[PDB]
């Protein structure tokens, strides 16, 4: 259908407690598949999905080599930003980056990303045209003139229209049995009293993939966009996911309420109820 | 932009030397390169601000660079050997992958004994008569010879004023006795000017060679005069008939 | 890793197409060009990625498959005579910008010697009468000067002479010898010189 690949960078300075540290995690859709951490003993790019181990030794030399070079690169970025914002070198600061691509069923590049942040605020980001930049403030504008003269956009475009899609298509093929086979949520409804008049009814979605899901409670077919307590989708740990929606209700009315589950891995929207 | 001092350096095999580089103010990145005669420069070491991040190009542990304040860089070469003889080039840039502005380079020659160091002898060769009749032009030749090391800057001076127009200096000095390891060099230059300027008794043409070698800090054991850093020049006056 | 001609010649005030071959380049490797003029540090000329770039001195033309590129000087002057380096600083994503200068291309710019007057002249020393020197001059670019086959006879490479007030350029070689018995008449015997080289004596 539609698939994404994303890389995520974190560089964090830590004055007088070592040189800045650089983490990288790689994602195909919601599956983590690669990792790198500069504080690791002999830092290298490590696999986090079975289907990536398939790549040969040339792959892992280049990947490790890139992440080592990025340790250096983001160490320079940290410094420059200090001077751009006139901030004492005694504090800690973070740079973050995400980039990657989206593909349709034909393999065609749907759209491309490359966004940079400084201390949790936008800094610079490549535009959807893959040709120009948006600089969040006057600091990031320095970077912009440099990157414009340097022609960084051209590199981003060359990557996103090329290697990005070529590799993503390859991982989807090699991991097809897991990446392109959606996992239906295993669902039930629980029952917990509050006093004599009030009970909570909770609607569980478990072991589903991808992360994207909707849960809604309905009193007599009316949406409780208000009175439903909804937790943010959480990871199980085994590469699938978890979610629950709940509502405060008076005793005996249990049957009036109904849980509705939407998920890619279900043939149809699922309705559910507390069992006597 | 970038400066490097000293421009030239003669060393006794075994003594220590320090090479200096002033990068362009505000540049985050600094690069040292070795350029050995006949080849392209060759990565020695890189600094990001004060941090020496990549010292992978340093021939041996004898080579020590620093950049205490992320500004000025110092490359120290200890126990200099003959093989260290090269031009050392300094480059700074706005950041790592940005264009590198280079200094003019420091020129090192390591010799076995400072007795091999000789300043040039200079001569001006007067225009040919037949050249004057034939082309209406006059060419003067300058020959600086018997010098070591190859550490000279040559210039022409007409009536007290340096001239660039009508001037051609060899880009490389010859070896006079190619056979020796410590052979001395000769270099040649030309200044061509229209006959009439040569046919004026009051026009003064002077060939000048700045030799770099020893200083008053150095110590001398020989009988001939200490071959210190010096101008040696020769000169010819114009001629009516 | 790049490959380029070891050397290249051209006329002054002419376009010069310096070629470079980079078979194994990344989809994301920048092409960079540097030059180094005689007795000066190297300088940046231009860089690019897939689309053609322009200065102001130079243009860069990258082939459609990007396996090769040409640096283009639109109007070469004498001052352009340099070594020209084609570098891939990123080296397939393994490196950060330190420069692996190649061997480079040596570019000589020749003056357009339109009205040549080939001649060998003898030049006495102004101080000492005896000491002598031979000057071969005013030949065009078709002529090559050789080092003479003799150890004790010194012959310089040709240099271009620029008389800017008279819009006048000339080639020369300088020859002198240790030997108290060498003649200008034979000094450039190891060269094929014009059949009408003027010999005064």
């Amino acid at each position: 259908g539609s698939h994404s690949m994303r890389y995520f960078y974190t560089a964090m300075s830590r004055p007088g407690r070592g040189e800045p540290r650089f983490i990288t995690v790689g994602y195909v859709d919601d599956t983590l598949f690669v990792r790198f951490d500069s504080d690791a003993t002999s830092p290298r790019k490590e696999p986090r999905a079975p289907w990536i181990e398939q790549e040969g030794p040339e792959y892992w030399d280049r990947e490790t080599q890139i992440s080592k070079t990025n340790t250096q690169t983001y160490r320079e970025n940290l410094r420059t930003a200090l001077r751009y914002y006139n901030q004492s070198e005694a504090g800690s600061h973070i740079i973050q980056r995400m980039y990657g691509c989206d593909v349709g069923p034909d393999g065609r590049l749907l759209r491309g990303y490359d966004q940079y942040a400084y201390d949790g605020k936008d800094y610079i980001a490549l535009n959807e045209d893959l040709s120009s930049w948006t600089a969040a403030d006057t600091a990031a504008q320095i970077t912009q003139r440099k990157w414009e003269a340097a022609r960084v956009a051209e590199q981003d475009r060359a990557y996103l229209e090329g290697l990005c899609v070529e590799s993503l298509r390859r991982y989807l093929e090699n991991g097809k049995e897991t990446l392109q086979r959606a996992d239906p949520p295993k669902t039930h409804v629980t029952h917990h009293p509050i006093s004599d008049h009030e009970v909570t009814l909770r609607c569980w979605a478990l072991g589903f993939y991808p992360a994207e899901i909707t849960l809604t409670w309905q009193r007599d077919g009316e949406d409780q966009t208000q009175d439903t307590e909804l937790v943010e989708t959480r990871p199980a740990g085994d590469r699938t996911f978890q979610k629950w929606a709940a509502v405060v209700v008076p005793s005996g009315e249990e049957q009036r309420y109904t849980c509705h589950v939407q998920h890619e891995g279900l043939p149809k929207p699922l309705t559910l109820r507390w069992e006597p | 932009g970038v400066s490097q001092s000293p421009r030239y350096k003669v060393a006794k095999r075994g003594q220590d030397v320090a090479l200096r580089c002033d990068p362009i103010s505000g540049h985050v990145s600094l690069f040292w390169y070795q350029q050995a005669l006949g080849q392209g420069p060759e990565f020695l070491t890189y600094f990001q601000n004060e941090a020496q991040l990549d010292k992978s190009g340093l021939p041996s542990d004898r080579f020590f660079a620093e950049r205490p304040e992320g500004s000025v860089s110092t490359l120290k070469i200890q126990r200099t050997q003959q093989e260290d003889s090269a031009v050392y080039l300094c480059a700074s840039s706005l950041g790592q992958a940005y264009e590198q502005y280079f200094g003019p380079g420091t020129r090192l020659t390591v010799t076995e004994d400072l007795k091999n160091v000789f300043p040039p002898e200079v001569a001006v060769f007067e225009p040919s008569e037949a050249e004057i009749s034939h082309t209406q032009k006059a060419t003067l030749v300058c020959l600086a010879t018997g010098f070591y090391p190859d550490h000279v800057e040559l210039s022409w001076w007409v009536n007290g004023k340096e001239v660039h127009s009508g001037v051609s200096t060899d880009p490389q000095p010859l070896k006079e006795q190619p056979a020796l390891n410590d052979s001395r060099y000769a270099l040649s230059s030309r200044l061509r000017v229209s006959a009439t300027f040569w046919q004026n008794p009051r026009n003064h043409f002077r060939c000048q060679v700045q030799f770099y070698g020893l200083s008053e800090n150095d110590e001398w054991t020989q009988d001939r005069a200490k071959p210190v850093t010096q101008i040696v020049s020769a000169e010819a006056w114009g001629r009516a008939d | 890793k790049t490959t380029q001609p070891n050397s290249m010649e051209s006329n002054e005030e002419e376009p010069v197409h310096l070629p470079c071959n980079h078979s194994t380049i990344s989809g994301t490797d920048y092409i960079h060009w540097y030059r180094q003029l005689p007795s000066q540090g190297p300088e940046y000329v231009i860089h690019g990625l897939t689309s053609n770039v322009n200065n102001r001195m130079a243009s860069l033309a990258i082939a459609e498959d990007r396996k090769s590129s040409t640096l283009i000087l639109h109007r070469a002057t004498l001052r352009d005579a340099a070594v020209y380096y084609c570098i891939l600083p990123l080296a397939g994503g393994t490196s950060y910008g330190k420069l692996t200068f190649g061997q480079g291309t040596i570019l000589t710019v020749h003056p357009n010697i339109q009205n040549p007057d080939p001649a060998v002249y003898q030049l006495r020393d102004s101080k000492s009468s005896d000491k002598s020197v031979c000057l071969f001059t005013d030949f065009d670019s078709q002529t090559n000067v050789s080092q003479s086959k003799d150890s004790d006879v010194y012959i310089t490479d040709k240099t271009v002479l620029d008389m800017r007030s008279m819009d006048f350029k000339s080639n020369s070689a300088v020859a002198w010898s240790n030997k108290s018995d060498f003649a200008c008449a034979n000094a450039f015997n190891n060269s094929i010189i014009p059949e009408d080289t003027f010999f005064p004596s």
């Binding site: 990288t24 070079t69 320079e76 970077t143 440099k146 981003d156 290697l163 | 950041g95 | 994503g93």
Partner: peptide, 9 residues
């Protein structure tokens, strides 16, 4: 696969 974005702030 990644790609190296060498150009700094």
């Amino acid at each position: 696969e990644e790609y190296l974005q060498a150009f700094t702030y």
